[PDB]
Amino acid sequence: SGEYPTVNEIPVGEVRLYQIADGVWSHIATQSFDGAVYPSNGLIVRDGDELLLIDTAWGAKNTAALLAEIEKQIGLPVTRAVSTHFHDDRVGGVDVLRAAGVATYASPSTRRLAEAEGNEIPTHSLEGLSSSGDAVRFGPVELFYPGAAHSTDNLVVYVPSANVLYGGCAVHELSSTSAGNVADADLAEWPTSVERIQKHYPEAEVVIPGHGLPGGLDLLQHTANVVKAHKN
Numbered sequence: 001s002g003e004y005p006t007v008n009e010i011p012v013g014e015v016r017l018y019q020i021a022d023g024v025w026s027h028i029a030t031q032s033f034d035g036a037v038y039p040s041n042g043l044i045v046r047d048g049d050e051l052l053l054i055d056t057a058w059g060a061k062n063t064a065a066l067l068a069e070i071e072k073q074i075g076l077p078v079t080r081a082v083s084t085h086f087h088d089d090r091v092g093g094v095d096v097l098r099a100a101g102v103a104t105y106a107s108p109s110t111r112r113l114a115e116a117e118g119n120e121i122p123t124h125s126l127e128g129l130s131s132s133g134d135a136v137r138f139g140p141v142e143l144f145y146p147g148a149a150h151s152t153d154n155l156v157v158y159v160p161s162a163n164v165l166y167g168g169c170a171v172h173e174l175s176s177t178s179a180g181n182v183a184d185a186d187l188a189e190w191p192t193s194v195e196r197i198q199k200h201y202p203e204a205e206v207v208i209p210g211h212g213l214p215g216g217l218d219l220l221q222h223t224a225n226v227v228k229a230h231k232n
């Protein structure tokens with residue numbers, strides 16, 4: 001009923017959208033992994049009379065449900081998708097997207113890692129993102145590579161029309177007491193990568209984490225704090 005959704009308010013097998021700003025939504029879905037249930041976020045950005053999707057809904061069936069929810073709530077076609085790193089919460093569902101006619105994109109680093117790991121593989125490579133601090137435009141967003149953090153390939157996404165910063169899994173929600181799943185992380189570099197984000201997007205008004213509730217710029221400092229303390 002207007003609050004940011006959570007696992008407790010998304011019916012089983014479902015996806016919910018949340019309006020962030022004019023022409024900007026997050027998508028929220030839930031998935032099981034190693035016997036626990038987790039929410040995860042993605043982004044939808046209006047691109048004229050089309051939509052740009054950022055990240056899958058963490059699985060084939062969740063991603064089909066995402067497309068159906070988008071058709072219900074927005075009614076514009078998803079023409080392109082970008083996955084912000086190689087984990088299943090970002091690429092699981094790329095096969096569904098591609099069979100629905102969505103053109104799927106990721107960095108070459110993400111594509112290589114996804115292939116090696118046995119995850120679904122976006123079709124198209126995003127060049128120009130291989131060095132930390134790199135940025136490229138992609139429709140209504142800017143894609144930024146901050147350096148290694150949650151993963152070595154993680155991208156962030158900025159929507160300049162709305163000053164919305166989608167941090168993906170390199171950014172954690174304010175209630176987070178832990179640095180999440182750090183299996184593929186670089187804890188030593190992560191605070192330096194967050195500092196790059198802070199420096200590049202000082203006018204961000206909304207910050208959206210890869211899992212959990214959006215907030216403001218404080219998510220970035222909080223993330224740095226939690227990662228340093230986890231490593232400590």
Ligand SMILES: C[C@@H](c1cccc2c(-c3c[nH]c(=O)c(F)c3)c(C(=O)O)[nH]c12)N1C[C@]2(C[C@@H](CN)C2)OC1=O
Nearest residue numbers: 033038087088089150169179180181182183184210211
């Ligand atoms: C798919 C993704 C994943 C699975 C389950 C939970 C999480 C969390 C998370 C946890 N706990 C939180 O409290 C939180 F808010 C977020 C995150 C995140 O933190 O982004 N990602 C998760 N995978 C799996 C795996 C690839 C590696 C096997 N080779 C292990 O790593 C990875 O991230």
Ligand SMILES: [Zn+2]
Nearest residue numbers: 085087150169
């Ligand atoms: Zn991940």
Ligand SMILES: [Zn+2]
Nearest residue numbers: 089169210211
């Ligand atoms: Zn994640």
